[PDB]
Design a binder for this molecule. Structure first.
Ligand code: FES
Ligand SMILES: [Zn+2]
Length: 130
């Protein structure tokens, strides 16, 4: 609902629980309420709100959609990278790759995933309908 201050993309709400799991611990005192996640590949911003912006360099976690080179995480619960997904998609086809990597099968995404959401959105963005 809130728009990224850098790229204008609508972000999705994330709780302090999620933000604290992904930002460098030295920045925890700056986490004072909800943030919004910027999912745009080109934008340096990862979390933003009225008070504070955390860019890629302020996170301890690599955010898959923001990374140009491997490792490019997609599923954080099951430790699946873009490379694993496309390697397997070439061998077994995109649908059997999702099934074989285990991407999307976890439940702890609000903490493991920087977006605070299940990795389906990124899987779908990559052409792996789930
Ligand atoms: S991040 Fe993929 S199932 Fe949680
Ligand atoms: Zn942005």
């Amino acid at each position: 609902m809130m728009r990224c201050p850098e790229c204008s993309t609508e972000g999705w709400r994330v709780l302090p629980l999620t933000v604290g799991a992904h930002v460098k611990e030295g920045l925890w005192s700056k986490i004072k309420g909800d943030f919004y996640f910027c999912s745009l590949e080109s934008c340096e911003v990862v979390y933003f709100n009225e008070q504070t912006v955390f860019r890629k360099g302020e996170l301890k976690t690599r955010v898959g959609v923001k990374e140009r080179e491997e490792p490019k995480p997609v599923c954080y619960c099951n430790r699946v990278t873009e490379k694993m997904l496309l390697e397997a998609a070439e061998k077994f086809g995109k649908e059997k790759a999702v099934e074989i990597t285990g991407a999307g099968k976890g439940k702890w995404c609000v903490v493991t995933n920087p977006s605070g959401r299940c990795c389906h959105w990124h899987l779908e963005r990559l052409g792996f309908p789930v």
